[PDB]
Ligand binder design. Structure first.
Ligand SMILES: Nc1ncnc2c1ncn2[C@@H]1O[C@H](COP(=O)(O)OP(=O)(O)O)[C@@H](O)[C@H]1O
Lengths: 38, 54, 374, 50, 128
């Protein structure tokens, strides 16, 4: 059994697309951000 | 712009339009063309017979 | 949690890429080579440098012998891999490995000891709080942005096809072919001999790779292009060596990548990449094939040859039934696509559940990686 | 020569920033067109069935 | 060639821009951190890449941080004496079992930005 072992269940598919679109939008605005401060 | 005019996700009972089999598309139209349920109820002579028999 | 971003490291056979989560492009991209000197050292007071790794190993390649730690997607030498990881973490990104989790990528069909040793190295030495291992071709679908499709990833070490339908991957239809740009570079170095040019050292292999990246393309029809090349000299191009000598590649330009479609030029018995993709499609069920026909995704640096998409579409259309519609999706950023997918996977709020904690590793040894991940 | 170099660098940056918008518009136009394709073929199938 | 041009555009714009912003910020912060400790003696550096070439200021910084006496620099102004002075600091770091990778004297002398920044970062991770 356990076909869904590697992934969690009952997750909204829209959120992944929204965050992918956000990463896409970062290129169009090409805002330059420094790395996180240690 | 038809595509701006209406949105598939705005109305679920318009969303039913997209996901229909063709023979299911005929069955609804033909069956509400016939109006059998209206015919049986509106016709009295069969109606009170069914009433009293039950 | 909010300001802390997990590091994303794409680790292929050819080049290593690294950056932060939530970024569109990787911060550090550099070749994965480790070079060592071979000649006499006579000037006293210049200092001692035992090993050269990364981009500045390429700059001084004249006096070095170059070794690749990863061969065919397998880490043959682990000490050099530790050198590459240390140079990535400290010199390239200037981040402490304790601060952030690490996301790694690998080939689909690999020996188990590779994954176990990756987990052991990233916990025992660099002391990371969490780590995850994923498949490159799965991350390519994240970068594409679609739920379903078949991914053909071709890098420097290995080529592989995986199909995914509705977020479900079929393990029995995953196909692996040991035919990448490494063997294409070797084939180009072999076929450049018949024009009088000889490259033998490991330093000249980088020159051959540069020649391949600058003056190669895929012909749409092989026999017609061969007849055209025999008839006229319009196909010839000139390249300049680092010492100022000029060579003329001529006929070889469309013959080096043609070994991807016909492996019999290399003596291999295996099928071409188009036949491999078609066979991976027909190994799936009947119903999903149409969708798998419509969302073929190209990835990896080997698929950057001009005209690869048209030839692939023509071959798949010839193999497939005529009533289906065949299109090949190749973004311009298909060299870095895997890394982008990793960032998209690393920044999800749900994926914070799926990290492998250090306590779980301490309980379960290096065998925890097979139970999680994929 | 130095002044000419850096002013032309500024020109190059401005012009690539110009090209990126055309890239985005191309992508979103194609993503608009494909669903029109998928719509007309289904509706034509319905018409033939009728 | 069109998609090849687009790929060159992408890896010319974004990969360069993010790395250059990060290294500029790191350069300013490392300059302030070095200037704070180097102000105990009468020493100050304006540029991290240029003033660290001669190898004297690296010796002064390591002397301030560690607290014992390193060997005095080789008395010279040539390239060979410069390499010797940087190698002295690198060998003193080899005493403290601090792990440096892809670090040589000529890399500091020539002025490679990433390796100098990595050396400063490694020193910060050790001596804080
Ligand atoms: N612009 C290009 N055109 C054609 N082939 C390329 C190009 N760039 C890289 N390659 C090929 O791809 C290989 C590098 O692939 P890469 O993306 O580094 O694979 P991985 O990252 O999976 O190791 C090189 O050896 C070369 O053969």
């Amino acid at each position: 059994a356990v076909p869904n072992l590697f992934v969690p269940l009952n997750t909204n598919p829209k959120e992944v697309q929204e965050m992918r679109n956000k990463i896409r939008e970062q290129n169009l605005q090409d805002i330059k951000t420094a790395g996180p401060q240690s | 712009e038809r595509y701006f005019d209406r949105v598939d996700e705005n109305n679920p009972e318009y969303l039913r339009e997209r996901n229909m089999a063709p023979d299911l598309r005929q069955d609804f139209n033909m069956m509400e063309q016939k109006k059998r349920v209206s015919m049986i109820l509106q016709s009295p002579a069969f109606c009170e017979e069914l009433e009293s028999m039950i | 949690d909010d300001d802390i971003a997990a590091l994303v490291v794409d680790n292929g056979s050819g080049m290593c890429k690294a950056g932060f989560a939530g970024d569109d492009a990787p911060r550090a991209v550099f070749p994965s080579i480790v070079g060592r000197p071979r000649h006499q050292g006579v000037m006293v007071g210049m200092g001692q440098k035992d090993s050269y790794v990364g981009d500045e190993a390429q700059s001084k390649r004249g006096i070095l012998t170059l070794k690749y730690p990863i061969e065919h997607g397998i880490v043959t030498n682990w000490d050099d891999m530790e050198k590459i990881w240390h140079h990535t973490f400290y010199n390239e990104l200037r981040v402490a490995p304790e601060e952030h989790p690490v996301l790694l990528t690998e080939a689909p069909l690999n020996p188990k000891a590779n994954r176990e040793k990756m987990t052991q190295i990233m916990f025992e030495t660099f002391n990371t709080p969490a780590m995850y291992v994923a498949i490159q071709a799965v991350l390519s679908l994240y970068a594409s942005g679609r739920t379903t499709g078949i991914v053909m990833d071709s890098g420097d070490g290995v080529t592989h096809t995986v199909p995914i339908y509705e977020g479900y991957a079929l393990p029995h239809a995953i196909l692996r072919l040991d035919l990448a740009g490494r063997d294409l570079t070797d084939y180009l170095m072999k076929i450049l001999t018949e024009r009088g040019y000889s490259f033998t050292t490991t330093a000249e292999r980088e020159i051959v790779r540069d020649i391949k990246e600058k003056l190669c393309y895929v012909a749409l029809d092989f026999e017609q292009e061969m007849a055209t090349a025999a008839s006229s000299s319009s196909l010839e191009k000139s390249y300049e060596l680092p010492d100022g000598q000029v060579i003329t590649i001529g006929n070889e330009r469309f013959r080096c990548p043609e070994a991807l479609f016909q492996p019999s030029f290399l003596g291999m018995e295996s099928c071409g990449i188009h036949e491999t993709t078609f066979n991976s499609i027909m190994k799936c069920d009947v119903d999903i094939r149409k969708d798998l026909y419509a969302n073929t995704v190209l990835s990896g640096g080997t698929t950057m040859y001009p005209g690869i998409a048209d030839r692939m579409q023509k071959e798949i259309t010839a193999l497939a039934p005529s009533t289906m519609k065949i299109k090949i999706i190749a973004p311009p950023e298909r060299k870095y696509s895997v890394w982008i997918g990793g960032s998209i996977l690393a920044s999800l709020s749900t994926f914070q559940q799926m990290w492998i904690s250090k306590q779980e590793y301490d309980e379960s040894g290096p065998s925890i990686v097979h139970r999680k991940c994929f | 020569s130095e002044g000419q170099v850096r002013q032309l660098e500024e020109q190059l940056r401005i012009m690539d920033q110009t090209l990126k918008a055309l890239m985005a518009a191309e992508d979103k136009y194609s993503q608009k067109e494909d669903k029109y394709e998928e719509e007309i073929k289904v509706l034509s199938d319905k018409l033939k069935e009728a | 060639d069109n998609d090849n041009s687009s790929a060159r555009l992408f890896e010319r714009s974004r990969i360069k821009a993010l790395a250059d912003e990060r290294e500029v910020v790191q350069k300013k912060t490392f300059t302030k951190w070095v200037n704070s400790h180097l102000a105990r003696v009468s020493c100050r550096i304006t540029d991290l890449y240029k003033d660290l070439r001669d190898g004297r200021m690296l010796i002064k910084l390591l002397e301030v941080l560690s607290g014992e006496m390193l060997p005095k620099p080789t008395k010279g102004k040539m390239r060979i004496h410069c390499l010797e002075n940087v190698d002295k600091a690198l060998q003193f770091l080899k005493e403290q079992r601090v792990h440096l990778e892809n670090m040589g004297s000529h890399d500091i002398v020539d002025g490679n930005h990433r390796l100098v920044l990595g050396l400063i970062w490694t020193i910060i991770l050790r001596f804080q």
